[PDB]
Design a protein around this ligand. Structure first.
Ligand code: GTP
Ligand code: MG
Length: 718
């Protein structure tokens, strides 16, 4: 439909805890915009915002939705996040793409922990925040109570903008303070009455109006003659002052609304359209190369694609935000990655579900295209002159993982296909195929996240899968040096296959001086360094073959045979464990036969000698250790330290700040297969953690003995 200038386009992302009456409020905006006819109810599951089958099946939103609402010369790009704790990826994508964040407060519950999580996310992403109160129709609500709760929760920089009078089911009016008005509605709701406030609330109205204008002046001093001295500049420049304060997060406004009764949603529309940071008036995004990318109509034609909703019967719709320039139907756009020079077609502006075709899209706006071929999530499409490969969006580390497998080992290709399709659906569904582990790894954000994926596989497509606990990457090694001796000769086949290998194994460190004397078994030996070569391992670790050939006792021409034997024994551990690392090998004695010396003899000799050397040496198992950064309030510091102590953890350091204390610990992955669920249960979901690999380390005797016993228990079947 009608094209809008970038100066009249705003991007808004709603944020709030579950059970906050937000998605409904979205239907309130859709109904009052006139784009839809009736105002549906989430109970009836007829809401336009909820169309994914799981989204109405669960009774709450699962994916973030994008939609447009039109008003007087202003159109708002409303993005409704799922609002749950385990759908962080949609929220962070919305924050990265949007311009401003909105927080909705439930009057019944007041400030909730999900509100804290969303506030932390937007603080990390540095976006403006406006507070809002929902559910004023519930008796279990007190505007003063939530006001003081938020006063004592965050800084004094915040300030309310409206003063509701009635409460609970009897709510039929409220007072606007920014514009100095009182609003009332019919019991049906929808038509505000701009009748002025009575003199009863005149005193408090003036008090909080003076407080608000003083706060706005402190946000930015406009130097106008009466601005901070006498009174505010009515309301016209108050919007600009509020926006400027929101630029630096110097003030967070507070609003109230009733979703069911539609109390003053028009007031919200007017306020949001009036005051909000502009698309250009915000800290501009950089590119991968670090060159500034200022959104402008006169700029080149580049597009970035983030959302790839694949809801059935509506097509593989792919949204996108216009980074710079414009876009027209029929244009040919280059693809930054796996470039194919995609030729575009009829574009559509979608209000969620139903979409409306549009002719031209300006920079800094969200559009949607269909029937694409080589466009995936995170891929960006650009013109010929504008080489951009935008990768400015970062997602939180996968806090949970599980191994997937269908009920029948006959649809592996279907697993790959649909799992990839879901990957694009939300990049958080990190899919990985560990070739060494022979398992397909799925990384999510929690138990409920994987439950959601399981439902989408089972019901949306009628596909059967199971979840199994992922395998653990174990690496073996040695600690005690030992002497390995072997002699080989086989006349049963062809040549004599003569072989004689004598070698010593030793754990390798970064700077050992490799001493030349080793008194083992009442026998000392002398080692002479002639050729030093280090061969690294692709699975990590290093191997060294400092030779000790006695003045040419064994020809170096056969050394690759010993090396091939060594790695052929090495790639399989003598016990359970994929490989071994940090092993220093010294070979001293050997014999050479003019006709019976051959490479296969040294193959077998090295293999068996190294196997029996590991048998003689002390085998040890190394468990991967992942650093954990728990961000938890002090009320559960004892519980978390006790749980970690029960999780064979090593305390590193406790950080102190505000009310949440950061924790550092070295923790084995073996007991972290379900750590996120336990942490969420203990802290009520009030804490998060970050995982990252550090260094393999040793394990106690009991766990390795159990692992070995299970290894032969499994092997006994074959
Ligand atoms: N009593 C009452 N309840 C409301 C009102 N508005 C919303 N709700 C409640 O809000 C619930 C739906 O929550 P949503 O609006 O979808 O917000 P959410 O918690 O983030 O859920 P999703 O966005 O769908 O994930 C409904 O079951 C209603 O009970 C209202 O005006 N009055
Ligand atoms: Mg909602």
């Amino acid at each position: 439909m009608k094209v809008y200038q970038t100066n009249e386009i705003k991007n808004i992302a709603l944020l709030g805890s579950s059970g906050s009456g937000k998605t409904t409020l979205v239907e309130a905006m859709l109904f009052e915009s006139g784009v839809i006819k009736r105002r549906g109810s989430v109970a009836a599951k007829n809401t336009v915002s909820d169309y994914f089958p799981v989204e109405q099946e669960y009774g709450y939103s699962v994916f973030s939705t994008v939609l447009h609402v039109e008003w007087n010369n202003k159109k708002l790009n409303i993005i409704d996040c799922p609002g749950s704790d385990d759908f962080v990826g949609s929220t962070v994508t919305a924050l990265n793409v949007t311009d401003t964040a909105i927080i909705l407060l439930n009057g019944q519950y007041g400030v909730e922990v999900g509100t804290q999580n969303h506030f932390r996310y937007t603080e990390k992403l540095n976006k403006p925040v406006i507070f809002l109160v929902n559910q004023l129709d519930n008796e279990k609500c007190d505007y003063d109570n939530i006001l003081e709760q938020l006063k004592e929760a965050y800084g004094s920089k915040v300030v309310p903008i409206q003063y509701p009078i009635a409460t609970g089911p009897g709510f039929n009016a409220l007072i606007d303070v920014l514009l100095m008005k009182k609003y009332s509605w019919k019991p049906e709701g929808g038509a505000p009455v701009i009748e002025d406030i009575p003199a009863e609330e005149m005193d408090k109205a003036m008090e909080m109006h003076k407080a608000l204008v003083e706060a706005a002046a402190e946000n930015d001093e406009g130097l106008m003659e009466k601005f901070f001295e006498q009174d505010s500049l009515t309301e016209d420049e108050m919007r600009e002052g509020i926006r400027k304060g929101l630029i630096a997060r110097g003030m967070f406004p507070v609003f109230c609304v009733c979703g069911g009764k539609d109390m003053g949603v028009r007031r919200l529309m007017e306020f949001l359209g009036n005051v909000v940071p502009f698309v250009s008036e915000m800290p501009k995004v950089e590119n991968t190369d670090g060159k500034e990318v200022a959104p402008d109509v006169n700029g080149p034609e580049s597009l970035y694609f983030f959302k790839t909703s694949v809801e059935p019967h509506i097509g593989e719709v792919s949204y996108f935000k216009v980074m710079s320039g414009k876009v027209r139907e029929g244009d040919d756009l280059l693809n930054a990655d796996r470039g194919s020079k995609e030729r575009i077609a009829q574009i559509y502006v979608v209000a969620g579900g139903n979409r409306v075709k549009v002719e031209e899209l300006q920079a800094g706006d969200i559009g949607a295209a269909v029937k694409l071929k080589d466009v995936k999530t995170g891929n960006t499409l650009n013109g010929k002159d504008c080489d951009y490969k935008f990768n400015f969006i970062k997602y939180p580390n996968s806090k949970y993982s599980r191994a997937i497998k269908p009920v029948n080992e006959a649809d592996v290709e279907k697993m790959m296909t649909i799992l990839n399709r879901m990957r694009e659906e939300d990049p958080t569904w990190v899919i990985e195929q560990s070739k060494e582990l022979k398992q397909t790894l799925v990384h999510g954000q929690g138990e409920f996240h994987l439950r959601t994926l399981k439902w989408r596989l089972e019901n949306n497509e009628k596909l059967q899968v199971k979840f199994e606990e992922p395998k653990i990457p174990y690496r073996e090694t040695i600690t005690k040096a030992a002497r390995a001796d072997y002699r080989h000769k086989k006349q049963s086949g062809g040549a004599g296959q003569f072989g004689e290998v004598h070698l010593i194994v030793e754990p390798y460190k970064e700077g050992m001086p490799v001493p030349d004397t080793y008194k083992f078994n009442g026998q000392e030996f002398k080692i002479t360094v002639r050729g030093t070569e280090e061969i690294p391992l692709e699975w990590g670790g290093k191997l060294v073959f400092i030779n000790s050939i006695v003045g040419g006792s064994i020809d170096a021409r056969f050394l690759p045979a010993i090396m091939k034997g060594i790695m052929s024994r090495l790639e399989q551990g003598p016990l359970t464990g994929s490989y071994a690392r940090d092993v220093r090998v010294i070979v001293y004695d050997g014999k050479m036969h003019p006709v019976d010396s051959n490479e296969i003899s040294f193959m077998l000799a090295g293999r068996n000698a190294f196997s029996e050397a590991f048998k003689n040496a002390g085998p040890k198992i190394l468990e991967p250790i992942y650093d954990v950064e728990v961000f938890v309030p002090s009320d559960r510091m004892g519980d978390v330290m006790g749980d970690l102590q029960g999780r064979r953890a090593m305390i590193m350091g406790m950080s102190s700040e505000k009310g949440f204390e950061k924790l550092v610990a070295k923790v084995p992955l073996k007991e972290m297969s379900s750590y996120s669920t336990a942490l969420s249960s203990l802290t009520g979901g009030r804490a998060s953690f970050i995982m990252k690999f550090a260094s393999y380390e040793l394990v106690p005797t009991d766990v390795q003995d159990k692992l070995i016993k299970d290894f032969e228990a499994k092997q006994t079947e074959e």
